[PDB]
Design a protein around this ligand. Structure first.
Ligand SMILES: *[C@@H]1O[C@H](CO)[C@@H](O)[C@H](O)[C@H]1NC(C)=O
Ligand SMILES: *[C@@H]1O[C@H](CO)[C@@H](O)[C@H](O)[C@H]1NC(C)=O
Lengths: 402, 100, 50, 50
């Protein structure tokens, strides 16, 4: 059994493609195999995504796994809604409720607004990029009026790489006007390293500051260089490295060769690629549940041109959605469950603080329990109590009237 | 619709775009070399083959706030016409130290 | 012009000149003076404060 | 360990100040003084460096 599926991978995404292959081997069965039709395109160009998608549609694909950018996300959400093609992706959660889209990335907005409430913050800096959308930025802006905060949001996205070392230092000289000691980085794991590289250069990582990396990959970026400054650094981690499922994953991952699988001879994995591996298991467990439920998904034939008018949404596509959205398997990104929209539910984002001995998990976030602490023992300082003996005699030691 | 005008051999296209479809116009225009004339909100950057009839309002509002000498105001916005003018009063909120 | 999904899509040559014509059009209209720079943005415009 | 911020002050006690890399402690805030025996503004040195 050859299940034709479409594959859209960014021109840069190398590790994300490597995990897409390991799931193919771990979840392969004598019942059926998946045949990935892979297109290496530029995710930012909406024209390239369009014909890569129109290529897969004419080639008769049952589901498409890929990535979208804030630019081309409209191209995927609009084409997958008319042609009824299912789309699986680890990219950022979308704006609203979109059909035929399986968003592997859980919603971080709720997890971020709880961490600010734990630290009891009231005035911080929100350095955001327009890459992953600003749905998380709208999550702190709409919530700024409710809890009455004061946030200085700076669009760190527009930065020229030649005037980068100048515009970065000049940026924090505006935050130094407020004596700013609390900064939130809402960026991908790459811009975090650049900003951190600039924080250390101007020495704004000493005792007094406090950072929170607002992405699902805390330990993704190099945190060992802001590990010894003095500033508290927090973040979010979706790939738990203490689970036995991931420990068996790392035991097999860290032993591979770095020639065939790029960036794989390491003991870590990015949150974007960890969702890609979990995306394959869901896709295998979706067409496996389509076999058990007896649903013929074999296409009638050539779907024709995507630009068909009137566009023919072939019928067996709407069933593939109900199969994917009913998958509830276990993988790297914890418990995987979706709702009727496609947003990840029943997930668990870990809150991670940065100390001296390395990363440190302090709790987790659930959309029904909010933030929950773990292992409060022991306190940083066990202050002893002093017993002071005295005798009752006026006016030295008396008892109050109440 | 753009692919219809393309095969029909048009020379210039006059139309509109929304926050969701603007990426489709500019990308297909930059790849197939089709001029696009539009009264919609100006694009956020230098997009080729885009004739934006609407003037950039961003500076006119920043100066109007600067005229009245406002320091603490409310900025009600709809996600419809984009948020290019939203980042304008947010990136300038730190230079001039407003409270938006 | 064939299908827009041409692979590879080769662009027609006469289209690039249509931009330079449009971006260099400098006539008068209801929105005041009309001029475009090399980006298509409106320049030399006049927004009236009311 | 962030001991190059505003307040610290280091003296590089060797004849080669501009010999090692200085661009990294250049923006931290601390002052770094040193000694240079090869002046790159002298005309004999510039024809040498050229
Ligand atoms: C939600 O996740 C928890 C993880 O412990 C699991 O026990 C539970 O069965 C999940 N609920 C559903 C409806 O899948
Ligand atoms: C600049 O704007 C004025 C305003 O009417 C206009 O008269 C003039 O032609 C413009 N300059 C150019 C070079 O078009």
């Amino acid at each position: 059994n050859s299940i034709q599926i479409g594959g859209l991978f960014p021109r840069g995404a190398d590790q994300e493609y490597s995990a897409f292959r390991v799931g193919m081997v771990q979840f392969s069965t004598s019942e059926f195999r998946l045949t990935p039709h892979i297109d290496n395109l530029e995710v930012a160009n909406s024209f390239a995504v369009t014909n890569a998608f129109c290529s897969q549609f004419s080639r008769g694909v049952y589901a498409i796994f890929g990535f979208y950018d804030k630019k081309s996300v409209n191209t995927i959400t609009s084409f997958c809604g008319t042609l009824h093609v299912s789309f699986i992706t680890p990219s950022f959660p979308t704006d609203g409720t979109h059909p035929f889209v399986i968003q592997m990335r859980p919603d971080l907005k709720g997890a971020l607004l709880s961490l600010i409430e734990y630290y009891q913050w009231d005035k911080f800096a929100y350095l955001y990029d327009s890459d992953r959308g600003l749905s998380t930025l709208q999550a702190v802006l709409d919530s700024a009026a409710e809890k009455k905060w004061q946030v200085t949001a700076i669009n760190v996205g527009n930065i020229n790489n030649d005037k980068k070392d100048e515009t970065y230092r000049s940026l924090f000289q505006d935050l130094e006007l407020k004596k700013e000691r609390r900064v939130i980085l809402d960026c991908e794991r790459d811009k975090v390293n650049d900003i951190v590289d600039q924080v250390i250069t101007i020495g704004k990582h000493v005792k007094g500051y406090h950072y929170i990396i607002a992405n699902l990959g805390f330990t993704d970026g190099d945190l060992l260089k802001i590990q010894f400054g003095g500033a508290e650094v927090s973040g979010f981690q979706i790939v738990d490295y203490d689970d036995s499922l991931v420990s068996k994953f790392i035991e097999r991952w860290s032993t591979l060769e770095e020639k065939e699988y790029p960036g794989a001879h390491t003991a870590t994995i990015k949150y974007t690629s960890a969702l890609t591996y979990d995306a394959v298991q869901v896709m295998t467990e979706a067409f496996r549940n389509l076999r058990k439920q007896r649903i013929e998904i074999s296409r009638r034939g050539n779907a024709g041109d995507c630009l068909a008018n009137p566009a023919v949404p072939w019928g067996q596509g709407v069933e593939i959605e109900r199969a994917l959205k009913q998958v509830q398997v276990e993988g790297l990104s914890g418990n995987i469950k979706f709702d009727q929209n496609g947003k990840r539910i029943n997930y668990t984002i870990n809150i991670m603080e940065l100390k001296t001995n390395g990363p440190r998990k302090i709790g987790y976030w659930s959309e029904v329990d909010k933030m929950v602490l773990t292992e409060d023992d022991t306190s940083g300082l066990e202050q002893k109590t002093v017993v002071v003996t005295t005798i009752l005699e006026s006016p030295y030691v008396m008892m109050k009237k109440n």
